[PDB]
Design a protein around this ligand. Structure first.
Ligand SMILES: Nc1ncnc2c1ncn2[C@@H]1O[C@H](COP(=O)(O)CP(=O)(O)OP(=O)(O)O)[C@@H](O)[C@H]1O
Length: 409
């Protein structure tokens, strides 16, 4: 009956070790920590976008104006509000203001076809108020009083497989934010580069950890990203300390660094994922990039709050596939066969994800039914699981259990 039924004790033990990830994080909820930072570090730079820099004081005053506007237009807590996803300051006031209003944001590329925008507004149940007026130039006002609710929806982000709106609530975002800050030692004087647009959820992993610590969110300009050599120059010039990259984009940077060895003395962390890559590439990186920067290899779908697993990439290895590693705090992952049985170590199965990272679901009740299911994995432990469509196997890597990606169904 249980998914681990046919496993021997040693095979069951490997999975129990792998998924031993429960962690309580200190003190106030995400928005309260953001408010505390703004009041303790008001003069610090909070966002450096393509059109200038806002202090924490200014960002929170602009966000407060947005929340007050939404309330004045009858947008009640638990509503969804569209924000125009650009590289400028205004979207940061928009999305923080939506959260201060007790609402969830849906990031919209203002260059998308009008027909696709129309679908997103209807599917998300989202008001276009902040698409039809500049959110940065709204009349000044304090944020209205929002009654406390647990696990409010924070965002609806569209991901494809056919667009589906992933509904992500505060406990998942708070959990991710604690991990980014604690795992990568984010400090007030740090500069978190945002490579992903606000329509792509690695942006979440840069924005909230910055504002939860008093660090500065530094938007990567469009023109810089598409030019690998310029991107390396820009990272040096802006003294970026933490960066999000998709694997293929990082490969473009590696080729540029091989052509012209780079110095990045201020860079401490690159969080990289999206595709399988190889220790030969990461070994080359560490020879041609003069930096203390460590590569944190990550895996995860949008449906499980950006990242689900992480591997600290060894710089001395130069052969084999980089594993996707161990679950984030309060995540549990299972490789299941076609009959929903837990695979032994070394056996390839489909990744199912449990824990604090899971989306509430999709906007579509049908899509939610097909993707999310309940399963007794071990005696006594019934899990809400998200089916990924991803394949992996549990392997031994440097005397520790790790997932190794094996492709898709
Ligand atoms: N480290 C890694 N190695 C291999 N595959 C990875 C990976 N990290 C992520 N993936 C793949 O990327 C998927 C997650 O995709 P998402 O992060 O949701 C963006 P997407 O859905 O590919 O694009 P979209 O949201 O723009 O439509 C995983 O389900 C897996 O297939």
């Amino acid at each position: 009956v249980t998914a681990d039924a046919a496993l021997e004790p040693d095979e069951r033990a490997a999975w129990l070790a792998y998924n031993d990830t429960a962690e309580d994080f200190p003190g106030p909820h995400l928005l309260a920590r953001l408010d505390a930072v703004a009041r303790e570090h008001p003069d610090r730079p909070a966002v450096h976008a393509v059109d200038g820099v806002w202090t924490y004081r200014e960002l929170h005053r602009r966000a407060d104006a947005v929340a007050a506007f939404l309330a004045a237009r009858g947008v009640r807590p638990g509503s969804v509000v569209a924000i125009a996803a650009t590289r400028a300051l205004a979207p940061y006031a928009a999305l923080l203001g939506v959260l201060k209003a007790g609402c969830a944001y849906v990031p919209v590329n203002p260059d998308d076809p009008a027909d696709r925008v129309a679908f997103v507004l209807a599917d998300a149940g989202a008001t276009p108020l902040l698409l039809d007026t500049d959110p940065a130039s709204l009349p000044a006002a304090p944020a209205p009083d929002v009654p406390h609710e647990p696990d409010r929806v924070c965002y609806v982000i569209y991901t494809s497989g056919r667009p589906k709106g992933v509904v992500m609530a505060e406990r998942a975002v708070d959990n991710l934010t604690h991990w980014v800050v604690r795992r990568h030692d984010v400090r007030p004087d740090d500069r978190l580069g945002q490579t992903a647009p606000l329509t792509f959820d690695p942006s979440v992993q840069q924005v909230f950890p910055a504002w939860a610590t008093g660090a500065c969110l530094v938007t990567v300009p469009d023109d810089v990203q598409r030019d690998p050599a310029a991107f390396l120059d820009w990272l040096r010039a802006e003294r970026v300390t933490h960066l999000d990259l998709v694997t293929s984009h990082w490969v473009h940077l590696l080729n540029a660094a091989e052509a012209r060895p780079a110095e990045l003395p201020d860079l401490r962390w690159i969080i990289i994922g999206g595709e399988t890559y190889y220790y030969h590439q990461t070994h080359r990186w560490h020879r041609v990039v003069s930096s203390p920067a460590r590569l944190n290899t990550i895996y995860g779908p949008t449906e499980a709050a950006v990242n689900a697993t992480e591997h600290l990439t060894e710089p001395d290895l130069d052969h084999g596939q980089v594993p996707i590693g161990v679950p984030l705090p309060n995540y549990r992952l299972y490789a299941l066969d076609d009959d929903g049985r837990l695979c032994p170590p070394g056996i390839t199965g489909e990744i199912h994800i449990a824990g604090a990272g899971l989306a509430r679901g999709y906007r579509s009740a049908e899509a939610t039914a097909k993707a999310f299911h309940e399963l007794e994995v071990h005696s006594g432990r019934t899990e809400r699981l998200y089916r990924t469509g991803d394949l992996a196997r549990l392997v031994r890597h440097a005397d520790r259990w790790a997932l190794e990606f094996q492709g898709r169904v």
